[PDB]
Amino acid sequence: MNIFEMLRIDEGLRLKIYKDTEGYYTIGIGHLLTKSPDLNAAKSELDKAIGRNCNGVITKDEAEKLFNQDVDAAVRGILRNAKLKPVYDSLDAVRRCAAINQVFQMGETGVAGFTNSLRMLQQKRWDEAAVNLAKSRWYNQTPDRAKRVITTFRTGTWDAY
Ligand SMILES: [Cl-]
Ligand SMILES: [Cl-]
Numbered sequence: 001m002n003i004f005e006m007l008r009i010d011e012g013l014r015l016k017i018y019k020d021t022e023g024y025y026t027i028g029i030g031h032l033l034t035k036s037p038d039l040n041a042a043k044s045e046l047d048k049a050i051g052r053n054c055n056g057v058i059t060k061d062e063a064e065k066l067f068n069q070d071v072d073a074a075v076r077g078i079l080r081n082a083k084l085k086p087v088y089d090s091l092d093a094v095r096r097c098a099a100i101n102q103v104f105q106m107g108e109t110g111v112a113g114f115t116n117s118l119r120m121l122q123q124k125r126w127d128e129a130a131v132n133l134a135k136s137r138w139y140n141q142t143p144d145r146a147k148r149v150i151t152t153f154r155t156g157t158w159d160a161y
Contacts, residue, residue, distance in 0.1 A: 001158040003071055003097045007104060009161055010145050013063060017042055017056040021142055027056075028063035030104065031070055074103045083111050087122045095121075098152040105145075106138060121153065130154040 011030030017039070020026040025033045025042035031049070033042040039056075046054050050062055058066075078084045078099065088099050111118075114136075120129035130150045133139065139146040151160035 001097075001161060003100050004067070006097055006101060006152075006158075006161060007067070007071065010101065010105075010148065013060070015058055015060065015063060017046065027058060027066075029067040029070075031063075031066045070104065071100065074100050077108055078103055081108055081111065083115075083118070084108065087118045090122045090124075092156055094156045094158065095153055098149050101149050101152075102138075105142075110138075126154045126156075 008029060013029055014027065017025055017027050017033065020030070020032065024035050025039065025045075027033060027046060033045040033049075036042065043054070043056050046056065046058070049066060050058060078088050084099075084103075088096060091099060114133075117129055117132045120132055130153060133150050133153065134146070136146075139150070148160040152158070
């Protein structure tokens with residue numbers, strides 16, 4: 001198990017434009033296209049991302065390429081973020097996967113909000129962190145997935161997957 005296998009399980013694979021859990025146009029393995037309610041806006045973003053006129057449909061290969069780019073982007077984002085980088089670097093490899101999973105789903109606009117959780121993670125107070133992480137809109141809106149990620153932070157094992 002690794003971040004690709006983990007996110008494949010959490011995000012699924014869909015080859016035509018669909019709406020994610022927040023109602024946003026998405027494709028492939030959790031590739032967010034746009035927050036716009038206009039489907040034409042999403043189709044444009046898709047063509048731009050893939051570099052051809054897709055008409056809302058892609059291949060598995062294209063889906064895996066976007067997935068690779070998106071994972072790479074999530075990691076680089078963490079490493080460029082002065083708040084996230086020291087916590088990330090303090091973690092073991094399995095817990096680093098949980099961290100990338102979060103950023104992949106949430107982006108990093110929630111950094112200030114998860115300040116207390118992040119401190120507990122860097123302190124390696126795993127049970128306290130896990131309890132704190134569940135006190136979130138994130139947990140309440142996607143509890144099954146959040147439970148899997150939190151368990152991964154708590155244990156440093158792949159037991160939830
Ligand atoms: Cl792209
Ligand atoms: Cl708490």
